[PDB]
Amino acid sequence: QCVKLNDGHFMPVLGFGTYAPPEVPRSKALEVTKLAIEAGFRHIDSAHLYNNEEQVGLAIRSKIADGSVKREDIFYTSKLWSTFHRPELVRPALENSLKKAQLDYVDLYLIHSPMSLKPGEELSPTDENGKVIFDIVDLCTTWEAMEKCKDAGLAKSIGVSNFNRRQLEMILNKPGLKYKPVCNQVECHPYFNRSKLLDFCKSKDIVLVAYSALGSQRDKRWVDPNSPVLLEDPVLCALAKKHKRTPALIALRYQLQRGVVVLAKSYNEQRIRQNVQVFEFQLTAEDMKAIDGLDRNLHYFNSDSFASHPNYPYS
Numbered sequence: 001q002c003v004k005l006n007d008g009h010f011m012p013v014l015g016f017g018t019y020a021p022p023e024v025p026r027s028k029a030l031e032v033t034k035l036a037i038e039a040g041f042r043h044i045d046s047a048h049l050y051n052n053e054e055q056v057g058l059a060i061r062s063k064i065a066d067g068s069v070k071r072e073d074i075f076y077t078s079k080l081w082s083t084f085h086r087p088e089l090v091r092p093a094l095e096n097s098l099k100k101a102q103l104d105y106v107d108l109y110l111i112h113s114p115m116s117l118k119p120g121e122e123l124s125p126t127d128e129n130g131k132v133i134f135d136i137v138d139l140c141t142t143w144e145a146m147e148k149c150k151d152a153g154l155a156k157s158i159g160v161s162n163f164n165r166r167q168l169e170m171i172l173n174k175p176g177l178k179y180k181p182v183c184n185q186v187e188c189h190p191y192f193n194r195s196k197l198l199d200f201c202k203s204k205d206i207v208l209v210a211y212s213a214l215g216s217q218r219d220k221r222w223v224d225p226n227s228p229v230l231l232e233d234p235v236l237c238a239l240a241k242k243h244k245r246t247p248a249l250i251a252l253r254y255q256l257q258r259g260v261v262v263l264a265k266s267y268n269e270q271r272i273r274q275n276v277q278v279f280e281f282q283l284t285a286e287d288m289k290a291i292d293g294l295d296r297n298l299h300y301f302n303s304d305s306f307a308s309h310p311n312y313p314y315s
């Protein structure tokens, strides 16, 4: 149940999302990642940003030691945070993630976001007016350093996240490009299905990886309070009744059948185990077109301040 990436490696089409807000104890990450592996998840999505690589790395270590899986069975993703876009900072950032997770390599390393921020120790650098400080970096130089990370053996594959078509093309058209990004991890769900970006990605043999595929965690820091709740969508719910599944399963299956690799975050054992059932049923072609009609250009991640970033992807 994997897709072949354009560098020859394989990515499981269903991945476990690991981000949880700060109110969630860090020990939970450890617990639930073990449950996910136990439930059958093999693709695990983390990031320096998430303050959990240590716990996720431990879960993997633990499941390897008890014989449940081997390292080669696990597909582990980390991401370069935006304060580390300057080329000389890329490898050290990766090495730090590897040290935290106690891993020798990541299966996939991504540029988390094209919106570069001031280099430093703060994840969100702010000036004396409390305004977040942008940085200007040629992402092609960042990519060059990512390429060196793949050659250094520290990342089996490299890709990007939250890039738009133009931004993807800047990398694809870079003089002397060695490695195309294997994927672009972007917000993708029935209310923002990214069909045009998906088509482009396919034409370039780049995998689109969907996040907030279940409608996001509706975190107060970036959600629109008035935005509809994805999993309460009448069409999704009617399809769930028809197939005797759940709205979540319909949403995940939607992505699988359109050739999208899909992430699913849950810190709940039963929902974690429910989510792997996505391989148990099929949506009809008519089902798929019906879901396609739900698109409303709705992103669950909003930021007025970042909307003014020169590399804001949604402009």
Ligand SMILES: NC(=O)c1ccc[n+]([C@@H]2O[C@H](COP(=O)([O-])OP(=O)(O)OC[C@H]3O[C@@H](n4cnc5c(N)ncnc54)[C@H](OP(=O)(O)O)[C@@H]3O)[C@@H](O)[C@H]2O)c1
Residues within 6 Å of the ligand: 016, 017, 018, 019, 020, 045, 046, 112, 161, 162, 185, 186, 210, 211, 212, 213, 214, 215, 216, 217, 231, 246, 248, 249, 263, 264, 265, 266, 267, 268, 271, 272, 274, 275
């Ligand atoms: N590259 C990026 O910038 C970026 C951005 C966002 C996310 N991501 C990645 O993608 C992952 C998932 O995206 P997401 O964090 O926005 O959350 P999500 O996958 O859209 O899931 C959102 C919520 O769905 C609930 N849920 C899960 N399974 C369910 C089920 N079977 N039935 C009903 N509800 C269910 C979970 O609550 P419970 O925990 O209570 O089950 C979760 O909080 C993240 O964890 C992260 O790894 C990356």
Ligand SMILES: COc1ccc2c(c1)c(CC(=O)O)cn2C(=O)c1ccc(Cl)cc1
Residues within 6 Å of the ligand: 019, 047, 049, 112, 113, 162, 301, 313
């Ligand atoms: C403090 O916690 C944070 C801070 C920033 C975050 C996130 C979480 C996430 C969720 C995750 O990756 O799971 C995305 N972020 C982004 O910057 C982002 C960048 C570009 C776009 Cl278009 C959307 C989100």
Ligand SMILES: COc1ccc2c(c1)c(CC(=O)O)cn2C(=O)c1ccc(Cl)cc1
Residues within 6 Å of the ligand: 123, 124, 221, 222, 301, 302, 303, 306
């Ligand atoms: C504590 O460290 C961080 C780092 C990055 C953060 C944040 C917090 C927040 C929450 C807040 O600032 O209130 C948003 N961020 C983003 O970059 C962001 C950019 C674009 C979008 Cl669409 C969403 C989030």
